[PDB]
């Protein structure tokens, strides 16, 4: 799509978050 944004935004959050949910959900909707 020629209209997508081709820029980088250097001030995006450069850090990782160890305190993020490390588990997965088997109960999430498997359909779409």
């Amino acid at each position, epitope marked *: 799509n020629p209209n997508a944004n081709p820029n980088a935004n250097p001030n995006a959050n450069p850090n990782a978050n160890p305190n993020a949910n490390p588990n997965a959900n088997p109960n999430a909707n*498997p359909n*779409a």
Partner: antibody
Amino acid sequence: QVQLVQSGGGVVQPGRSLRLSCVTSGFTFPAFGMHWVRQAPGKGLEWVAVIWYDGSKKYYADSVRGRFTISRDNSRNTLYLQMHSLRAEDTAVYYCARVKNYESSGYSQCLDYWGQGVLVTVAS
Amino acid sequence: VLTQPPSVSGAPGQRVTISCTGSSSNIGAGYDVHWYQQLPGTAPKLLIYGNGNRPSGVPDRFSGSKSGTSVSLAITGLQAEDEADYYCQSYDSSLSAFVFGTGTKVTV
């Protein structure tokens, strides 16, 4: 209109592999997630495996993990459960079930349409 | 993991109720419990889903409700066509695996 037909049962000696299949018709197969449910003879139902619509994410029960493998051939409306190292406890009727599309606050996957039921016997 | 009475009974025409007791992570966590009807042979079919929502084709004699950490399946009429095994199903967050009940036989 909806239909789930199964095949692949029989008697398998312990330690040998076996593959079950579930051919579907009457609905858009790629758009639905699917389960396998095992019913020991005279016991209650229990869960075996679930596969997402595209097949990216799969989750197995504890007692079948590392031996069983669930997969789908999305281009010809069929679902598989590949069983390896079949032990003596993996004897039951295996049902192929489809995850129903519904929305609720406390959503938990429900299986609206079920396969016919295939018997797998492990003996001798 | 979900506990149900071994069996229930009643004269035809009367009402019966099947219970399904779960822990704080199965039903107390807010997860819906679905019920399946299993005739001999005859792979089980969805009976009620999401704490009592009836799918199309199920007679109005079947209903359900949620109360605390256990639910119930109220059957009215109790006809000979209801002779079957009824199983719960819900998701256990502590195990992160779908849980089926021990199942109850309705003998009428």
